[PDB]
Amino acid sequence: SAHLQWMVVRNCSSFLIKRNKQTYSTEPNNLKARNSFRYNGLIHRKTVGVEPAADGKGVVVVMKRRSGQRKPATSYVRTTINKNARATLSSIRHMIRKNKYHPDLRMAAIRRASAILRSQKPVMV
Amino acid sequence: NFAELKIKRLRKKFAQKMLRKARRKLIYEKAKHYHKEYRQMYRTEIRMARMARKAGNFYVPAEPKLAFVIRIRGINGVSPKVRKVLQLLRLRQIFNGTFVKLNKASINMLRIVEPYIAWGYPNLKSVNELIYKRGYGKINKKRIALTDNTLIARSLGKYNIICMEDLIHEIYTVGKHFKEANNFLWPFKLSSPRGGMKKKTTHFVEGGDAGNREDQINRLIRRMN
Amino acid sequence: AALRPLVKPKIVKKRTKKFIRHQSDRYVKIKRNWRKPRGIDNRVRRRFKGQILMPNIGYGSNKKTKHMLPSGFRKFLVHNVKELEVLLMCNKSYCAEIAHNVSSKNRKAIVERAAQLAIRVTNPNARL
Amino acid sequence: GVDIRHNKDRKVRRKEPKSQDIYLRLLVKLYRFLARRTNSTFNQVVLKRLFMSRTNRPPLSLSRMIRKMKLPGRENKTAVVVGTITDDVRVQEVPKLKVCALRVTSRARSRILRAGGKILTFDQLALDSPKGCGTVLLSGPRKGREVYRHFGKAPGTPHSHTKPYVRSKGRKFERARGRRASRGYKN
Amino acid sequence: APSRNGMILKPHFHKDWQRRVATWFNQPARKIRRRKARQARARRIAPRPAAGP
Amino acid sequence: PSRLRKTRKLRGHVSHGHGRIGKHRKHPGGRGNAGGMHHHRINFDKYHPGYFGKVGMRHYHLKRNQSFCPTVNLDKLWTLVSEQTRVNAAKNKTGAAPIIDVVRSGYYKVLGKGKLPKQPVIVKAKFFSRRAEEKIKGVGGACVLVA
Amino acid sequence: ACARPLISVYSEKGESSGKNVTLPAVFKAPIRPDIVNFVHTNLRKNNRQPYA
RNA sequence: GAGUUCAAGAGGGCGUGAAACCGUUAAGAGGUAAACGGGUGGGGUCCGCGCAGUCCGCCCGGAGGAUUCAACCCGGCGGC
RNA sequence: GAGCGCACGGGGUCGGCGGCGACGUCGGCUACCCACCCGACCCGUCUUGAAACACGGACCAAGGAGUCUAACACGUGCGC
RNA sequence: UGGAAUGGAGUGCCUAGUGGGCCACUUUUGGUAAGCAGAACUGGCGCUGCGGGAUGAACCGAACGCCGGGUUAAGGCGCC
RNA sequence: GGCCGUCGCCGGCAGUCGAGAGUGGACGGGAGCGGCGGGGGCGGCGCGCGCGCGCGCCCGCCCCCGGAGCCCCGCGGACGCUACGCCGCGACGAGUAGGAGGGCCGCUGCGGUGAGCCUUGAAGCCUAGGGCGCGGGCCCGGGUGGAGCCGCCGCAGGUG
């Protein structure tokens, strides 16, 4: 019913903020903000998200478990990736595609993980 | 599966190149055939003239089968009967024009709005020029610029008309399928005539620009492109 | 935090030199704000030559240049730090202009983050 | 400029009219993707019937459907009603229907399923018959509302047979003059 | 323009309606008082049926 | 909801309905049904054809209770009974015929309309009708009065 | 929908108890916000006190 | 002047203190009443700079470095 | 029996082209504040006819009304 | 499907404003005539700006989104 | 010719070839040195690179989506698909009285909702300051002030 629970929340004030003629969404597992119903993590059955690691260095990738019903305590599987920048992309690029796991977000996830790893050093430009 | 489908790509592409080269010969030989016909249809007018003169008889030429009608008066103050006549010639904007077949049904129509149109007989140069520069076709009620032979063919293929050259012939020597080849052409939009008109509100016989100007409309089509 | 923005088009405006409403002769009782004159003898409603201009939808701007700041970005009114991270992906065409109510204690907190994320802020430190 | 008239430039049946609630919105989101990409017309007709107003999808009686699925050469086909399907206590005989409709009334659902027939919804149909093959299409009586006994030639003109608005039916409201020739006036 | 039911309606006194009442907000606070009458009457006459004779 | 009314979109217009050539005043042309016989005649003669006059034979203390006589057609004459009843043709000790009260269901007259399934019946009701008595007989059942 | 899953009951200290209960049929009914909105903004108007 | 006060740009009809209107200072100007629709001159103004703008962005060669645990695989272990 | 190309007077522009001025000066469509030169009758309403020698109007602030509410009834649309 | 030319037609509801009009080519009644009163046809003005008639409801040209380039109608080209 | 908007194409998109691109898995024999013996007809549509992108019998792999390589992806992302979204074609745009649609125009209160903002300074008020929108208006900087205030979803009205 992924579509159905999107028809309910497509505009109902949950996480959306609408200002200056731009629409944004603030969820966990949303690899952008501007778009919707392709990057929500609350909605779909298999959602991948890339967020900065807690320890301050590196990045964290979170996949959603498919097996097991909606038990939010153990729905999401987390992992830590602390490599050089290039191998970090290969890890994330490998996981999304070679698992065939929701490959809509292969390209969006890579760019998300780059900027997360970019800001974890002195600014480059 | 790869190899058998591999042949599929080449047969289709080759049949495409196959079919294209066949077309280009066809469109070619047409205009060659026509250019022979336009020439002969010319010297068969010179012929009949000269052969009469030697014997002292007069050769009366043909009443012409075409007439290009250009509107010279805008919307304002248009009479009821007039605004219906020149909306059947699909003239709905000042300085627009269409080719009109000539016959007793239409002559009286062009008598009703005689103070509102300047019309004569287009020479081959004009029908050549009016269709090559201002030729927009009415495809799906959405006028589009005739820059290819597919557009003419895909909407006139059932009458033999398949090319830009043919669309000029049928209009010129009104054929068995003149109505559609004259309807496929969205009415022309012709600029204001450089050099003036010396008056808009009077018939051409009194030295102005309106009404029958049998052979001088070739001039007024030169100045509007 | 100024990057080269993504694409830098020619921001050409038909007009935005303000439309003032008819009859601000000496009247302070009439504001500069616009209200279409709905009179019957009115010289402006009637579109006379040499009166004020009267807005019509022909003054619009490009669909792909409308709301573009002169520097090349587009605005977004940001209240706290966690309303920035939305711009962490659309950061090459969106600038986070900070609001008027934030104290100067945590405006340095917001501006500090914008440097990290390379998010352009049109309103860097104004208070001290 | 041109001298056309603009009355009819705008069209009241647009590229797309309305729809209301999420379940219906999903249906239209489906039967639009089936209408524009298939080359059929049953999908287009169903599409342009999911937009209509509740006043233009009147209920289809169970009796009416039987008498249209009884006709020769019409057995083995799945009836398709875009509106709703009421029960009808005036049918004492057993049907054997196979129906697909939006809303089927509790009593009508109790009867159709009872007889051995099968009942379908507009998302089971798209899987079973996408191009729209094998379906008898129907519609409830569109001019069956009570109000249509009011529209027409205005009452009180020579041959008008139209029901006039009135507070009630009775002795004194109806026939005073204009309804009986003993009173100087009858049309 | 009149093309409808040829009706005529009663609020037609040129002295007020308002001299005559127009409110009904008691009945949620009235239904509670009455229920207190029954619930005190029932306990008063102890064993005999509470639904009268 | 005053934010949906059209007066909210009618600010700035010098009259916002009711025009200005004749500013429609407090009440032009009588209050209520005024006229209607000599200057609203045209409206009253083609939207209420009979309005002025009477048809006689008054009844003075009409007690509408004594004229209570609701009617039930034959089409929905098997609706008054349950389903274990009608189904039984030769089953569950439903023999030649069942019995249908109508005075019980609330109706008195039995009006004839529509086909009646071929089962013998005993329709009991305070009144009847000529067709409604013919059709019941034609099925095989009998018409029985009660009061 | 159909085929109601098995819900697992939790104790007074977390640590899911053994006993389970089948998910009741209500949780599968149509959602349709335009009802839970129109049935709401009426039943929120029934506690108004008068003001005049 | 001094002083109380966080404040008297809270002073005993004193929270905030706009517009009509007036004084004064600064700037610009002046014979077709003032006022209104296009460019130049000026600005007690401000705004962003700017002795260069080697602007960034990926991928290849280069000569220096440096970590090598490090790349590669292989084995162990866990999660999907 | 097979690639190279001019691509093209070709399904809408590109330079595998250059130069200046930059710490006593650059840029501000946007949009300003004043001033100069080019075009322009005072608003609301009744009216066939408004700038009218037709009436209301000194200027500013707040308040300010074709409806609001109840009852009818009609049609339209939404959900049972 | 059967004279020429044009683009889709048919149909149901609910309906606010109007019911003070005026001008011109022609046709035309009363009048001496009227910038007068009264009629038919068409087009205008009211509801409508723009180029021209120096000025102006209604004449001639022409019908309005914001602009650049080109050419025009009616008017004109001593100087303004 | 550029740009805005309205309207039309019963428009296109679940990642598009169609400005005419004429589809499949096998079987049995003969087998095809390329395709289905429609052209001076000169009339809608039947030749020059076919049998290389990368790959085979006296190896196999239709090539684990270590890519069918797509010069468009049918399991499969463009800036791209908030379908109430995105995109492509054309025609057109004046208007009082009057009607309708859209307002991320504006005011006041209420149920939700921003782990919203606020004495390290709210509401307001001023402003030769920086800007967005055609416009209703909005946002930011500077000054004064001294305690409350705003955005999003719906709701109501003594709302300009």
PDB file of C-alpha atoms in Angstrom, chain G residues 2-52:
ATOM      1  CA  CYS G   2      -6.809 -10.126   4.398  1.00  0.00           C
ATOM      2  CA  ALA G   3      -4.838 -12.746   6.340  1.00  0.00           C
ATOM      3  CA  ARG G   4      -4.536 -10.845   9.603  1.00  0.00           C
ATOM      4  CA  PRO G   5      -0.995 -11.235  10.986  1.00  0.00           C
ATOM      5  CA  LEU G   6      -0.151 -12.233  14.557  1.00  0.00           C
ATOM      6  CA  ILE G   7       0.430  -9.435  17.063  1.00  0.00           C
ATOM      7  CA  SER G   8       2.702 -10.214  20.008  1.00  0.00           C
ATOM      8  CA  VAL G   9       1.776  -8.963  23.468  1.00  0.00           C
ATOM      9  CA  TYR G  10       4.275  -7.109  25.654  1.00  0.00           C
ATOM     10  CA  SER G  11       4.499  -7.430  29.418  1.00  0.00           C
ATOM     11  CA  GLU G  12       4.825  -4.799  32.155  1.00  0.00           C
ATOM     12  CA  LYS G  13       8.621  -4.720  31.697  1.00  0.00           C
ATOM     13  CA  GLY G  14       8.944  -4.929  27.943  1.00  0.00           C
ATOM     14  CA  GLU G  15      10.226  -8.353  26.927  1.00  0.00           C
ATOM     15  CA  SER G  16       7.320  -9.604  24.811  1.00  0.00           C
ATOM     16  CA  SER G  17       5.120 -12.114  26.589  1.00  0.00           C
ATOM     17  CA  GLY G  18       4.387 -15.481  25.028  1.00  0.00           C
ATOM     18  CA  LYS G  19       0.681 -14.905  24.450  1.00  0.00           C
ATOM     19  CA  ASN G  20      -0.364 -13.518  21.062  1.00  0.00           C
ATOM     20  CA  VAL G  21      -3.543 -11.979  19.671  1.00  0.00           C
ATOM     21  CA  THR G  22      -4.720 -11.869  16.069  1.00  0.00           C
ATOM     22  CA  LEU G  23      -4.906  -8.379  14.624  1.00  0.00           C
ATOM     23  CA  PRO G  24      -8.558  -7.237  14.762  1.00  0.00           C
ATOM     24  CA  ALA G  25     -10.353  -6.638  11.487  1.00  0.00           C
ATOM     25  CA  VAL G  26     -10.765  -2.904  12.124  1.00  0.00           C
ATOM     26  CA  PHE G  27      -7.136  -2.132  11.256  1.00  0.00           C
ATOM     27  CA  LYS G  28      -7.742  -3.115   7.618  1.00  0.00           C
ATOM     28  CA  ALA G  29     -10.729  -0.859   6.885  1.00  0.00           C
ATOM     29  CA  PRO G  30     -10.490   1.922   4.286  1.00  0.00           C
ATOM     30  CA  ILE G  31      -8.581   4.997   5.400  1.00  0.00           C
ATOM     31  CA  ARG G  32     -10.201   7.866   3.445  1.00  0.00           C
ATOM     32  CA  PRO G  33      -9.081  11.047   5.250  1.00  0.00           C
ATOM     33  CA  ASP G  34     -11.934  13.112   3.791  1.00  0.00           C
ATOM     34  CA  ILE G  35     -14.252  11.279   6.194  1.00  0.00           C
ATOM     35  CA  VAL G  36     -12.071  11.566   9.292  1.00  0.00           C
ATOM     36  CA  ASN G  37     -11.883  15.245   8.383  1.00  0.00           C
ATOM     37  CA  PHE G  38     -15.528  15.997   7.610  1.00  0.00           C
ATOM     38  CA  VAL G  39     -16.724  13.862  10.517  1.00  0.00           C
ATOM     39  CA  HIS G  40     -14.249  15.803  12.626  1.00  0.00           C
ATOM     40  CA  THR G  41     -14.785  19.473  11.834  1.00  0.00           C
ATOM     41  CA  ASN G  42     -18.415  18.883  12.707  1.00  0.00           C
ATOM     42  CA  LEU G  43     -17.923  16.959  15.966  1.00  0.00           C
ATOM     43  CA  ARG G  44     -15.515  19.721  16.975  1.00  0.00           C
ATOM     44  CA  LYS G  45     -18.313  22.271  16.580  1.00  0.00           C
ATOM     45  CA  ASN G  46     -20.608  20.610  19.122  1.00  0.00           C
ATOM     46  CA  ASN G  47     -18.860  21.887  22.264  1.00  0.00           C
ATOM     47  CA  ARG G  48     -19.178  25.574  21.392  1.00  0.00           C
ATOM     48  CA  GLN G  49     -20.741  27.736  23.916  1.00  0.00           C
ATOM     49  CA  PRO G  50     -22.898  30.562  22.576  1.00  0.00           C
ATOM     50  CA  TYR G  51     -21.397  34.009  22.161  1.00  0.00           C
ATOM     51  CA  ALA G  52     -23.324  37.126  21.237  1.00  0.00           C
TER      52      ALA G  52
END
